Enzyme design. Structure first.
Site, PDB file in Angstrom:
ATOM      1  N   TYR A  45      22.248  15.078 -18.760  1.00 22.67           N
ATOM      2  CA  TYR A  45      21.514  14.162 -17.945  1.00 22.67           C
ATOM      3  C   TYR A  45      20.651  14.885 -16.957  1.00 22.67           C
ATOM      4  O   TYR A  45      20.886  16.055 -16.627  1.00 22.67           O
ATOM      5  CB  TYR A  45      22.451  13.149 -17.203  1.00 22.67           C
ATOM      6  CG  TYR A  45      23.172  13.800 -16.045  1.00 22.67           C
ATOM      7  CD1 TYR A  45      24.299  14.585 -16.241  1.00 22.67           C
ATOM      8  CD2 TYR A  45      22.689  13.677 -14.747  1.00 22.67           C
ATOM      9  CE1 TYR A  45      24.945  15.231 -15.207  1.00 22.67           C
ATOM     10  CE2 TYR A  45      23.342  14.327 -13.708  1.00 22.67           C
ATOM     11  CZ  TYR A  45      24.476  15.098 -13.912  1.00 22.67           C
ATOM     12  OH  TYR A  45      25.148  15.749 -12.917  1.00 22.67           O
ATOM     13  N   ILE A  75      29.132   5.729 -11.552  1.00 21.58           N
ATOM     14  CA  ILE A  75      28.485   4.538 -11.024  1.00 21.58           C
ATOM     15  C   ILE A  75      28.325   3.445 -12.100  1.00 21.58           C
ATOM     16  O   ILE A  75      28.289   3.713 -13.301  1.00 21.58           O
ATOM     17  CB  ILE A  75      27.126   4.855 -10.367  1.00 21.58           C
ATOM     18  CG1 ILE A  75      26.155   5.506 -11.378  1.00 21.58           C
ATOM     19  CG2 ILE A  75      27.343   5.634  -9.094  1.00 21.58           C
ATOM     20  CD1 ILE A  75      24.740   5.634 -10.845  1.00 21.58           C
ATOM     21  N   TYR A 101      25.035   3.597  -5.463  1.00 22.45           N
ATOM     22  CA  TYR A 101      25.850   3.933  -4.294  1.00 22.45           C
ATOM     23  C   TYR A 101      25.702   2.893  -3.167  1.00 22.45           C
ATOM     24  O   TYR A 101      26.291   3.099  -2.115  1.00 22.45           O
ATOM     25  CB  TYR A 101      25.445   5.317  -3.773  1.00 22.45           C
ATOM     26  CG  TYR A 101      25.731   6.432  -4.734  1.00 22.45           C
ATOM     27  CD1 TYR A 101      24.850   6.705  -5.787  1.00 22.45           C
ATOM     28  CD2 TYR A 101      26.838   7.254  -4.554  1.00 22.45           C
ATOM     29  CE1 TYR A 101      25.098   7.714  -6.682  1.00 22.45           C
ATOM     30  CE2 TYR A 101      27.095   8.296  -5.464  1.00 22.45           C
ATOM     31  CZ  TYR A 101      26.203   8.516  -6.495  1.00 22.45           C
ATOM     32  OH  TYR A 101      26.470   9.575  -7.373  1.00 22.45           O
ATOM     33  N   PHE A 118      17.618   8.039 -14.048  1.00 23.85           N
ATOM     34  CA  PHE A 118      18.237   9.039 -14.895  1.00 23.85           C
ATOM     35  C   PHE A 118      17.562   9.133 -16.241  1.00 23.85           C
ATOM     36  O   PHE A 118      17.104   8.137 -16.794  1.00 23.85           O
ATOM     37  CB  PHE A 118      19.705   8.706 -15.156  1.00 23.85           C
ATOM     38  CG  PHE A 118      20.570   8.715 -13.953  1.00 23.85           C
ATOM     39  CD1 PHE A 118      20.739   7.556 -13.185  1.00 23.85           C
ATOM     40  CD2 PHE A 118      21.224   9.874 -13.561  1.00 23.85           C
ATOM     41  CE1 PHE A 118      21.554   7.584 -12.091  1.00 23.85           C
ATOM     42  CE2 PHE A 118      22.073   9.877 -12.451  1.00 23.85           C
ATOM     43  CZ  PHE A 118      22.208   8.723 -11.700  1.00 23.85           C
TER      44      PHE A 118
HETATM   45  C1  LIG Z   1      32.843   3.637  -9.526  1.00 20.77           C
HETATM   46  O1  LIG Z   1      31.752   4.073  -8.722  1.00 20.77           O
HETATM   47  C2  LIG Z   1      31.639   5.441  -8.522  1.00 20.77           C
HETATM   48  C3  LIG Z   1      32.276   6.413  -9.287  1.00 20.77           C
HETATM   49  C4  LIG Z   1      32.064   7.760  -8.978  1.00 20.77           C
HETATM   50  C5  LIG Z   1      31.228   8.163  -7.946  1.00 20.77           C
HETATM   51  C6  LIG Z   1      31.034   9.559  -7.625  1.00 20.77           C
HETATM   52  C7  LIG Z   1      29.648  10.074  -8.060  1.00 20.77           C
HETATM   53  C8  LIG Z   1      29.546  10.195  -9.589  1.00 20.77           C
HETATM   54  O2  LIG Z   1      28.073  10.326  -9.926  1.00 20.77           O
HETATM   55  C9  LIG Z   1      27.547   9.451 -10.739  1.00 20.77           C
HETATM   56  O3  LIG Z   1      28.213   8.499 -11.095  1.00 20.77           O
HETATM   57  C10 LIG Z   1      26.253   9.762 -11.268  1.00 20.77           C
HETATM   58  C11 LIG Z   1      26.102   9.448 -12.663  1.00 20.77           C
HETATM   59  C12 LIG Z   1      26.796  10.563 -13.469  1.00 20.77           C
HETATM   60  C13 LIG Z   1      26.098  11.865 -13.199  1.00 20.77           C
HETATM   61  C14 LIG Z   1      26.037  12.158 -11.720  1.00 20.77           C
HETATM   62  N1  LIG Z   1      25.611  11.013 -10.874  1.00 20.77           N
HETATM   63  C15 LIG Z   1      24.779  11.130  -9.816  1.00 20.77           C
HETATM   64  O4  LIG Z   1      24.568  10.150  -9.135  1.00 20.77           O
HETATM   65  C16 LIG Z   1      24.098  12.418  -9.527  1.00 20.77           C
HETATM   66  C17 LIG Z   1      22.915  12.367  -8.602  1.00 20.77           C
HETATM   67  C18 LIG Z   1      22.451  13.577  -8.026  1.00 20.77           C
HETATM   68  C19 LIG Z   1      21.285  13.389  -7.021  1.00 20.77           C
HETATM   69  C20 LIG Z   1      20.182  12.563  -7.579  1.00 20.77           C
HETATM   70  C21 LIG Z   1      20.737  11.226  -8.078  1.00 20.77           C
HETATM   71  C22 LIG Z   1      21.806  11.440  -9.090  1.00 20.77           C
HETATM   72  N2  LIG Z   1      25.051  13.482  -9.128  1.00 20.77           N
HETATM   73  C23 LIG Z   1      24.909  14.780  -9.630  1.00 20.77           C
HETATM   74  O5  LIG Z   1      24.078  15.014 -10.520  1.00 20.77           O
HETATM   75  C24 LIG Z   1      25.761  15.785  -9.083  1.00 20.77           C
HETATM   76  C25 LIG Z   1      25.057  16.867  -8.356  1.00 20.77           C
HETATM   77  C26 LIG Z   1      25.682  17.218  -9.600  1.00 20.77           C
HETATM   78  N3  LIG Z   1      27.079  15.415  -8.599  1.00 20.77           N
HETATM   79  C27 LIG Z   1      28.118  15.270  -9.481  1.00 20.77           C
HETATM   80  O6  LIG Z   1      27.881  15.182 -10.681  1.00 20.77           O
HETATM   81  C28 LIG Z   1      29.451  15.262  -8.900  1.00 20.77           C
HETATM   82  O7  LIG Z   1      30.420  15.033  -9.925  1.00 20.77           O
HETATM   83  C29 LIG Z   1      30.600  13.732 -10.339  1.00 20.77           C
HETATM   84  C30 LIG Z   1      31.495  13.538 -11.384  1.00 20.77           C
HETATM   85  C31 LIG Z   1      31.749  12.233 -11.828  1.00 20.77           C
HETATM   86  C32 LIG Z   1      31.147  11.165 -11.215  1.00 20.77           C
HETATM   87  C33 LIG Z   1      30.250  11.316 -10.183  1.00 20.77           C
HETATM   88  C34 LIG Z   1      29.987  12.621  -9.757  1.00 20.77           C
HETATM   89  C35 LIG Z   1      30.593   7.177  -7.214  1.00 20.77           C
HETATM   90  C36 LIG Z   1      30.778   5.806  -7.508  1.00 20.77           C
HETATM   91  O8  LIG Z   1      30.250   4.772  -6.828  1.00 20.77           O
HETATM   92  C37 LIG Z   1      29.441   5.074  -5.696  1.00 20.77           C
END
Ligand SMILES: COc1ccc(CC[C@H]2OC(=O)[C@@H]3CCCCN3C(=O)[C@@H](C3CCCCC3)NC(=O)C3(CC3)NC(=O)COc3cccc2c3)cc1OC
Length: 128
Positions: A45, A75, A101, A118
């Site tokens: 992604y 999310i 979020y 995304f």
């Molecule tokens: C049930 O609802 C949630 C479940 C989990 C979370 C924690 C954050 C979660 O990230 C995401 O769900 C999404 C989609 C999957 C890829 C990462 N992501 C992001 O939002 C991005 C983001 C970065 C900045 C620009 C907008 C997108 N996050 C990332 O790419 C990074 C920097 C690397 N962070 C992570 O991937 C941290 O690890 C995880 C691992 C699993 C779920 C989520 C984050 C948040 C939630 O609700 C707010």
């Protein structure tokens, strides 16, 4: 760019029909199967704030991102959107705050009330 095109022309893939998760297929996948709730899914992604200049670069793009579909591990927009993908598909997904979020955001990188964008590549999935 793609965020504007998806906003305007993307398919509404939500149950509420609130245009909260909008999709356009970028690369057509294989077959007709899609991942099922509970499956382990494996993706590549890129993501950003929908108005952002560049995709975020803070993960290894070569490593699969793995989660269990429909379990609230990611999310809401991803649980909804990845469920609609065929193996090998790449899509664009535009995610309104209620499916991302929300009012809390994830500060500093994700402000309050942020719309996200995304590109997701579905590599594989399995029910094990
Ligand atoms: C049930 O609802 C949630 C479940 C989990 C979370 C924690 C954050 C979660 O990230 C995401 O769900 C999404 C989609 C999957 C890829 C990462 N992501 C992001 O939002 C991005 C983001 C970065 C900045 C620009 C907008 C997108 N996050 C990332 O790419 C990074 C920097 C690397 N962070 C992570 O991937 C941290 O690890 C995880 C691992 C699993 C779920 C989520 C984050 C948040 C939630 O609700 C707010």
């Amino acid at each position: 760019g793609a965020p504007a095109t998806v906003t305007e022309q993307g398919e509404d893939i939500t149950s509420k029909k609130d245009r909260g998760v909008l999709k356009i297929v970028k690369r057509v996948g294989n077959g007709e199967e899609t991942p099922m709730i509970g499956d382990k899914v494996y993706v590549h992604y890129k993501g950003k704030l929908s108005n952002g200049k560049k995709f975020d670069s803070s993960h290894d793009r070569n490593e699969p991102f793995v989660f269990s579909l429909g379990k609230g591990q990611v999310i809401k927009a991803w649980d909804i959107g990845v469920a609609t993908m065929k193996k090998g598909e790449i899509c664009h997904l535009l995610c309104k705050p209620e499916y991302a979020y929300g009012s809390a955001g994830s500060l500093p990188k994700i402000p309050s009330n942020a719309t996200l964008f995304f590109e997701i590549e579905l590599l594989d999935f399995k029910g094990e």
